[PDB]
Design a protein around this nucleic acid. Structure first.
Ligand SMILES: [Mg+2]
Length: 34
RNA sequence: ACAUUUAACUAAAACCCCUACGCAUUUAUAUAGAGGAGACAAGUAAGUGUACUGGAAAGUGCACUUGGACG
């Protein structure tokens, strides 16, 4: 790009929620074949 | 281009040329028409030179500058 504005690095907060939900769904009991 | 006569027992008389200027030359004024300047009135950074496109506004190509940015 001919001109790039200042770059700010922001932490992506949303992905952590999905990661935690996945680490929980891994160990969950859902019932008999359902 | 153009030319020395009379007179002279004291001394005098006589004297007269033709060519230029124009459909030339210089500057100026008036006038058809055309065109300017001024006044009034109301994301691609920025430039220089040059070139093309476009009715314009502008866009793009090549080289150059920081009189920009890069915590
Ligand atoms: Mg140019």
């Amino acid at each position: 790009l001919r001109n790039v504005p200042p770059i700010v690095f922001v932490q992506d907060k949303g992905n952590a929620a999905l990661a935690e939900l996945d680490q929980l769904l891994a160990v969950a009991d859902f019932g008999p074949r359902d």
